Amino acid sequence: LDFLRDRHVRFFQRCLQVLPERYSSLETSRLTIAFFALSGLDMLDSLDVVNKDDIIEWIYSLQVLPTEDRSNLDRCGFRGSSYLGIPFNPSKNPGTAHPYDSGHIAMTYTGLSCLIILGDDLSRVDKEACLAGLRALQLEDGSFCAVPEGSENDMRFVYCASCICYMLNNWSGMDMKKAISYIRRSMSYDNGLAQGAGLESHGGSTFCGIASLCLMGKLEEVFSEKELNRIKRWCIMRQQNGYHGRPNKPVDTCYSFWVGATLKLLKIFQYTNFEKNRNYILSTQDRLVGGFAKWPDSHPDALHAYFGICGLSLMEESGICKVHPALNVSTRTSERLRDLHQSWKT
Amino acid sequence: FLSLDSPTYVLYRDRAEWADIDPVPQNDGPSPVVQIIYSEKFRDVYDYFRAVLQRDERSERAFKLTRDAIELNAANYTVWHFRRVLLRSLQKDLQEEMNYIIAIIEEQPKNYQVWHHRRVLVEWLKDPSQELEFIADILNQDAKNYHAWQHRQWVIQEFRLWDNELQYVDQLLKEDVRNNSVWNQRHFVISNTTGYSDRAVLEREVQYTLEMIKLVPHNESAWNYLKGILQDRGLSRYPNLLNQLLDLQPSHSSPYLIAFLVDIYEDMLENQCDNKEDILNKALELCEILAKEKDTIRKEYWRYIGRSLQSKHS
């Protein structure tokens, strides 16, 4: 019915506190759950209800710093959590060598992203080490892996790489030419972007692709006007009321951001139907515990709560900050990041 | 060996074979964030896992420990990596590991780590003999599982197994002509074998799609395929298509058809066609039909398209 702002604020507060053993599968990616919650509070202008200082220390304890002999540069970045059992060290002393300890691209991304949201200035971030680690993750085809030990590679990680380079304001972290090639090669016959060449185009990968190009500032350069028109068509066809991620699939709240943000970057979100979208998103709101679910009368989670709110933000919901569609942080945060970049250039 | 729910299950801290190892606990510092609470049993397994990892112990007991860690949480990518390290060190029977992962994936078909693990195994064995059947089983519980289709394309390409895919595709399109994943697979097979440059193939495909469209006219996937295989050749270069579509409009109408027409007319305008000002009017007329009555939800979009055509061809 209406936006239960306070309820959602408590929801995110709880997420930062303690989770039931039934969310153990998120252990190695707790940092992204932190992001969903922090960025979600930021989006609701409630970052005051948390101790920015404690959380900043926690995040820094997750950074994989290079060792004395700088022999582990290709493995630096951030961890999803402390699951490896390394002694709590908030980026103070050097690096305590460990056979299997290394960063995860999605954690380096959400980590830096969280630090900026909390006001930190990234002075304790070994920028060169992170960039070195990033480079190590890129494959011949231009895409990226999540960890140096090996993993699947797709558009999700291309977006992570792009965000990292953007925030550290240094693109030496990737071979941009090859990344762009990968993004082009992922365009389907139906004109959407897929996780990789030949695969079914999808709302999530289309967002990752388009947002990556925007972050590099090369959308126009990479896709022709005819091409962009075709992509726009594929994207806007995703709205049913709310948005689905693929043709002939039921809608899901989070696509209101994935696809909506893409439409925004392509400058035609304004031509979508706001009311039906807003109504759907709200219909998935959990009026009892707060947060949003993928479908109405479904269990809520951090991911849908955050993206449902960002989806609402795209339409300027009363009480929600404007979201930076490509960086996935509040404009306030994106602005603060600009100030930060300026200060460095001295 | 010893199941996690066996009446006689024993914590690792109470097992004689593990007495020489000092368990390593996880610490999130003074003020923990998004901290997950773990049961005695769960924390026990992982406290020993950390210990074994930290020492890179390539032992048989470590290998068995991973099975338990994976049961507690199959999304821990580090556990899977270490298990692979052990598979090599202990030179374990990979054919058996295939059975293991085959079961794990059936219970967790949307997990990234399990699909990655299976792919590494198939690469090691250079044996794709059981892949297509396995994937078909998974696609049977969820015909749109992205992980399954992704793996299926990898196998088919890596070991060149195209011989029966187009037939598999035809079968699934019969089971559900609306499955967007299957239409994508169809284009994957064809463009990687015969290609679409053979006028005979193009004709077979355009004809096949129109047949499917006639069966279920309101199917975005079918229309997207039809437009997909022709858009780069030039929609205006197929005069009989334009009329065959206009003939469907009477009964088999849908926003997809109307849209296709608009795209045909636009290709014409883009190619200095005859009676330009007349074509543009035919287009605009359709854009408005879409906005006002056929695809109302995209009302502002279609009118936006209309304004675009006018300011470009006048």
């Binding site: 992204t32 999605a106 999540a146 999700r156 999530g204 993928k294 | 990234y112």
Partner: peptide, 6 residues
């Protein structure tokens, strides 16, 4: 149910 992104 839920959406797996990692």
């Amino acid at each position: 149910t839920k959406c797996v992104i990692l």
